[PDB]
Design a protein around this motif. Structure first.
Motif, PDB file in Angstrom:
ATOM      1  N   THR B  38       0.835  -1.190   0.000  1.00  0.00           N
ATOM      2  CA  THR B  38       0.000   0.000   0.000  1.00  0.00           C
ATOM      3  C   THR B  38       0.873   1.244   0.000  1.00  0.00           C
ATOM      4  N   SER B  56      -0.240  -3.730  -6.420  1.00  0.00           N
ATOM      5  CA  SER B  56      -0.176  -5.180  -6.544  1.00  0.00           C
ATOM      6  C   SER B  56      -1.279  -5.880  -5.749  1.00  0.00           C
ATOM      7  N   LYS B  57      -2.347  -5.152  -5.427  1.00  0.00           N
ATOM      8  CA  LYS B  57      -3.577  -5.725  -4.876  1.00  0.00           C
ATOM      9  C   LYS B  57      -3.369  -6.328  -3.488  1.00  0.00           C
ATOM     10  N   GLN B  58      -2.502  -5.698  -2.700  1.00  0.00           N
ATOM     11  CA  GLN B  58      -2.336  -6.017  -1.281  1.00  0.00           C
ATOM     12  C   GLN B  58      -2.017  -7.497  -1.073  1.00  0.00           C
ATOM     13  N   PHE B  59      -0.843  -7.890  -1.565  1.00  0.00           N
ATOM     14  CA  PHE B  59      -0.421  -9.282  -1.509  1.00  0.00           C
ATOM     15  C   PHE B  59       0.045  -9.712  -0.123  1.00  0.00           C
ATOM     16  N   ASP B  60       0.082  -8.812   0.855  1.00  0.00           N
ATOM     17  CA  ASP B  60       0.611  -9.174   2.163  1.00  0.00           C
ATOM     18  C   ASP B  60      -0.376  -8.966   3.304  1.00  0.00           C
ATOM     19  N   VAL B  61      -1.661  -8.782   3.018  1.00  0.00           N
ATOM     20  CA  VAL B  61      -2.674  -8.734   4.062  1.00  0.00           C
ATOM     21  C   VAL B  61      -3.734  -9.783   3.760  1.00  0.00           C
ATOM     22  N   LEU B  62      -4.458 -10.172   4.803  1.00  0.00           N
ATOM     23  CA  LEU B  62      -5.537 -11.134   4.643  1.00  0.00           C
ATOM     24  C   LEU B  62      -6.671 -10.513   3.840  1.00  0.00           C
ATOM     25  N   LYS B  63      -7.363 -11.345   3.066  1.00  0.00           N
ATOM     26  CA  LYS B  63      -8.420 -10.850   2.200  1.00  0.00           C
ATOM     27  C   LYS B  63      -9.534 -10.200   3.017  1.00  0.00           C
ATOM     28  N   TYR B  66     -12.541 -12.688   3.271  1.00  0.00           N
ATOM     29  CA  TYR B  66     -12.154 -13.893   3.989  1.00  0.00           C
ATOM     30  C   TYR B  66     -13.333 -14.441   4.779  1.00  0.00           C
ATOM     31  N   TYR B  68     -14.395 -16.182   7.568  1.00  0.00           N
ATOM     32  CA  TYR B  68     -14.018 -16.681   8.885  1.00  0.00           C
ATOM     33  C   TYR B  68     -14.926 -17.817   9.330  1.00  0.00           C
ATOM     34  N   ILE B  71     -13.998 -21.438   7.551  1.00  0.00           N
ATOM     35  CA  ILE B  71     -12.889 -22.221   8.082  1.00  0.00           C
ATOM     36  C   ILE B  71     -13.101 -22.518   9.562  1.00  0.00           C
TER      37      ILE B  71
END
Lengths: 209, 99, 281, 99, 101, 181
Positions: B38, B56-63, B66, B68, B71
């Motif tokens: 970001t 790059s569409k936030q490749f290092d945070v959880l979607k 998601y 919850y 899962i």
């Protein structure tokens, strides 16, 4: 050195471990539940036990006296009145597919972000495999997606499973397999010199209590 | 590499400000933002506008989508499946041993 | 004692085929009530072990008690049907047992416990001439049963057919060559069977048993008495004679040492004075 | 002379237990210390050497009654141990140094 | 003794504490952006000692070996526990008329 | 952990997505706006600022150092008089830092922020006069030594657009500049 959120560690790193562990335990218990059910014929178990008897005779026959061994081998390898000669008869993908399906589902549901970094470097050629959900072509190949983590756990928990857990043929063809191997055996008595071997020393009376 | 096309088209889906137009722009400031995906963007003209850009569409945070609950329910659907299959296998082995 | 020790005792008395029915039932009757909740699926094997032992103890007040709690948990099980047949046979009801076993053999033709209880009656009824034949037929069907191969040896020895008992003890020694007892009992059979053609095997086997178990004393006595019997034989050559008089002396040089250590263990009693006067003869 | 399989299998099971436990411990330790690249695959060999020393000390003199040969004390479970070592190494690294 | 389990437990606890300490130090070093990037030898010594103690403990809790010679397990057997066959048991002996007729 | 069972309480979050924008305007007014919502957390006014001045904002010390406060510098040059002024302040609260900046007796031509830091973790700032003498801030003894040992690696370049010149000067050891290119 990227900075990842602890939410990833709490919802993609640990859940993958839990999944790949408990699904392996489930697969083991299901393999036990569906173990086997085969047709058992009395003649089949009889010929199997006879084959085992012939095997232990040609293997441990050097312990009985010579004459009894000759009588047994004669009764077994006789062209007439011999059992092997006279008596003639009248005759995994499913295991590994669930792991691949679970890997595909984990790739589908946990795609779009980096999961963890393996501490040993990997070549760049494997970037489209370990980083399926990422569009970065500049990020190192050590940073892997979720599917790579799942497969690493699948391959690394196989040996851990051993800690938590405890860990007849064609008769017409089988008879010849033992006949041809027993026709070449001879008696080699092991007790022909046991007396002198015993007289070499005294008896181990120590520890009779 | 894409072949050379001289027309650099402007698509409305690329505007980092949907309708929060900044009238008479005069500068754009970008900050590294602590993460690696970001960038903190501050466009100052007449109006001031602040946002975050993910090249790059936030490749290092959880979607954000998601699931919850999915899962958190599959974990129990596996734990209880293990807990019932253990006893099922034990009872089946007992029945097999005692015929 | 704790229940975790009583369970180990009931497991040890089951690994080895002991028949101390009194001491088994005395501990089983407690585990049925005093510690039934401490052990789970271990109570069924304990039920089976206690029922058969109380049968030997002549106490049917516990046999049927352990039989009904097995008939309930395992409805229609073949092991519990065999237990019922054994109870019938213990209560002198040899008539319903044959019918029950024929009904068992028609559902699973591979069953062997019914085949063995079908000859258990013949051994109990005294028809040993028929029991030996019905057991030889079963052996011809199910080879490798190391229990029936020993029961056949026992039946042949009791029938004084020492010749054919050796054929069973050989089948037993080929599968358990590391067992010294099978060597000792074969040496005894060869000793009782004939003369020089068999004493030559008995002497070898009484020594092989010693080599496999140096603490065995029956094998030592057998070796001494077989060496002396070949030394005192007319058809024995001078070479065999002197070798046998050497074997006997070598065995006697250790018999007294065993007895010397025994008499040393008991500071009051002295056993060395008992056997030595026999060895000098 | 006569070898009982129920004892050689028990000894092999004890060796595999030791191997699988030491491999996991060594993966955890390498992940904690942050070792990477070659210094992890060298620490694995040092840990295997330590485990073999401990096994030789456990068997001690008169070990021939336990094992037919001293080779399983060295080579026993090198690959099956290396896989679990890599797994636990990655786990402890990506949960201690990363994040 | 049976205290090896407690030994491996304390070793694993010390290893987890060393892991937490390393996580804290890594967070601090990523906060201040220092070029040293050297783990404190204080926590490294703890990690190594805990690893050594835990490995030596699990070497002992793994279970003892057994002799390979079969003639060693039957050295205490007696013929009184080998003649008996649980399948061919007969109940028409004297124990029935003697013990509890 | 067991116990658990505004401008002062403002602190850094995890991702570091929330920062404090220190904005300078042409009217001589400085604002501090939180980047998360946009509320003006502090204001400051520089009197006697002309409409056509030239401003330059330099972050000297950040908040990573706990005992030392953050410190920003602002160099404002009057277009007519040429007299430039340094204003040092705390970019989180806005109070003028008690460290008195030097009185720049000559018109400042340009400035340069080095990665060289004082013992107080303050990135040095060099301002080149009209007489081409360099003034360092902070001009402590440690920074003086770190410049006497790092002088020939510092180069200024000035671009005069009215004459079309591009000169480049080299920093000597005694804070003097020599024309290089």
């Amino acid at each position: 050195e990227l900075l990842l959120d602890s939410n990833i560690r709490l919802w993609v790193v640990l859940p993958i471990v839990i999944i790949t562990f408990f699904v392996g335990m489930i697969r083991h218990y299901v393999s036990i539940l569906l173990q086997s059910d085969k047709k058992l014929t009395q003649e089949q178990v009889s010929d199997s036990q006879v084959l085992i008897r012939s095997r232990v005779l040609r293997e441990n026959g050097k312990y009985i006296p010579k004459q009894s061994f000759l009588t047994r081998k004669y009764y077994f390898n006789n062209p007439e009145d011999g059992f092997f000669k006279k008596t003639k008869r009248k005759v995994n993908v499913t295991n590994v597919l669930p792991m691949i399906l679970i890997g595909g589902w984990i790739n589908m549901t946990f795609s779009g972000f980096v999961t963890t970094k393996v501490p040993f470097p990997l070549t760049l050629r494997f970037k489209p495999m370990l980083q399926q959900g990422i569009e970065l072509l500049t990020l190192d190949a050590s940073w892997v997606s979720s599917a790579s983590w799942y497969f690493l756990n699948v391959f690394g928990l196989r040996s851990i499973y051993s800690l938590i857990l405890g860990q007849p043929a064609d008769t017409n063809k089988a008879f010849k397999t033992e006949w041809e191997a027993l026709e070449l055996t001879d008696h080699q008595w092991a007790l022909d010199d046991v007396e002198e071997e015993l007289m070499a020393k005294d008896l181990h009376f120590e520890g009779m209590f | 590499l894409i072949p050379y096309s001289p027309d650099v088209q402007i698509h409305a889906e690329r505007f980092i400000n949907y309708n929060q137009t900044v009238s008479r722009m005069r500068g754009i400031y970008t900050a590294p933002s602590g993460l690696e995906s970001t960038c903190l963007v501050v466009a100052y003209g007449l109006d001031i506008y602040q946002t975050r850009v993910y090249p790059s569409k936030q490749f290092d945070v959880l979607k954000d989508d998601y699931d919850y609950v999915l899962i958190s329910s599959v974990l129990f659907g596996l734990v209880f499946a293990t807990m019932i299959t253990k006893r099922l296998a034990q009872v089946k082995l007992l029945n097999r041993a005692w015929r | 004692v704790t229940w975790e020790e009583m369970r180990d005792k009931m497991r040890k008395w089951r690994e080895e085929n002991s028949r101390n029915s009194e001491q088994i039932v005395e501990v089983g009757e407690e585990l049925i009530n005093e510690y039934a909740s401490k052990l789970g699926d271990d109570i069924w094997i304990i039920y089976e072990q206690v029922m058969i032992a109380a049968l030997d103890y002549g106490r049917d007040d516990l046999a049927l008690f352990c039989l009904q709690e097995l008939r309930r948990q395992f409805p229609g099980s073949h092991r519990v049907k065999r237990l019922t047949g054994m109870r019938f046979e213990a209560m002198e009801r040899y008539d319903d047992a044959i019918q029950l076993y024929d009904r068992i053999l028609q559902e699973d033709p591979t069953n062997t416990a019914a085949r063995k209880r079908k000859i258990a009656i013949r051994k109990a009824q005294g028809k040993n001439v028929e029991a030996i034949r019905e057991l030889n037929e079963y052996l011809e069907q199910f080879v490798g049963d190391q229990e029936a191969w020993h029961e056949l040896a026992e039946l042949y020895i009791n029938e004084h057919d020492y010749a054919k008992a050796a054929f069973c003890l050989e089948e037993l020694m080929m599968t358990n060559p590391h067992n010294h007892l099978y060597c000792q009992q074969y040496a005894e059979v060869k000793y009782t069977q004939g003369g020089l053609e068999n004493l030559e095997l008995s002497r070898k086997y009484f020594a092989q048993a010693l080599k496999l178990n140096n603490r065995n004393m029956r094998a030592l006595f057998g070796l001494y008495m077989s060496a002396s019997h070949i030394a005192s034989n007319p058809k024995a050559s001078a070479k065999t004679k002197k070798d046998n008089m050497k074997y006997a002396s070598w065995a006697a040089s250790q018999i007294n040492r065993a007895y010397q250590f025994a008499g040393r263990s008991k500071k009051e009693t002295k056993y060395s004075l008992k056997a030595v006067e026999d060895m000098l003869e | 002379p006569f070898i009982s399989e129920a004892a050689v299998r028990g000894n092999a099971a004890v060796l595999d237990y030791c191997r699988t436990s030491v491999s996991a411990l060594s993966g955890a330790t390498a992940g904690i210390l942050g070792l990477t690249g070659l210094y992890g695959f060298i620490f694995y060999l040092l840990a295997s050497v330590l485990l073999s020393l401990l096994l030789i000390l456990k068997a001690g003199r008169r070990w021939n009654k336990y094992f037919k040969s001293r080779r399983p004390l060295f080579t026993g479970g090198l690959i099956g141990g290396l896989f679990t070592y890599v797994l636990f190494w990655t786990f402890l690294y990506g949960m201690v140094h990363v994040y | 003794p049976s205290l090896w389990k407690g030994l491996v437990g304390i070793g694993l606890f010390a290893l987890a504490h060393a892991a937490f300490s390393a996580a804290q130090h890594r967070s601090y070093m990523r906060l201040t952006e220092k070029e040293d990037e050297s783990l404190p030898i204080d926590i490294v010594l703890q990690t190594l000692l805990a690893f050594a103690v835990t490995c030596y403990g699990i070497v002992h809790i793994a279970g003892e070996f057994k002799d390979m010679d079969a003639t060693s397990e039957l050295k205490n057997k007696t013929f009184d526990t080998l003649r008996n066959h649980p399948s061919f048991y007969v109940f028409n002996h004297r124990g029935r008329v003697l013990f509890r007729p | 952990w067991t116990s658990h069972l505004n401008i002062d309480t403002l602190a850094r979050d995890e991702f570091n997505l929330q920062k404090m924008m220190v904005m300078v305007t042409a009217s001589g007014k400085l604002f501090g706006i939180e980047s998360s919502s946009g509320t003006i957390l502090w204001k400051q006014y520089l009197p006697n600022v002309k409409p056509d001045s030239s401003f330059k904002l330099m972050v000297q010390r950040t908040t990573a150092h706990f005992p030392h406060p953050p410190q920003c510098t602002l160099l404002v040059k009057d277009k007519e008089s040429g007299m430039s002024s340094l204003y040092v302040f705390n970019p989180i609260f806005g109070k003028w830092s008690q460290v008195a900046p030097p009185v720049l007796k000559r018109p400042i031509l340009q400035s340069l922020l080095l990665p060289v830091m004082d013992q107080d973790y303050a990135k040095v700032l060099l301002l080149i006069d009209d007489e081409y003498k360099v003034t360092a801030f902070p001009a402590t003894r440690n920074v003086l030594r770190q410049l006497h040992e790092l002088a020939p690696s510092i180069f200024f370049y000035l671009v005069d657009a009215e004459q079309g010149r591009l000169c480049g000067y080299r920093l000597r050891k005694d804070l003097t500049t020599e024309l290089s290119w």
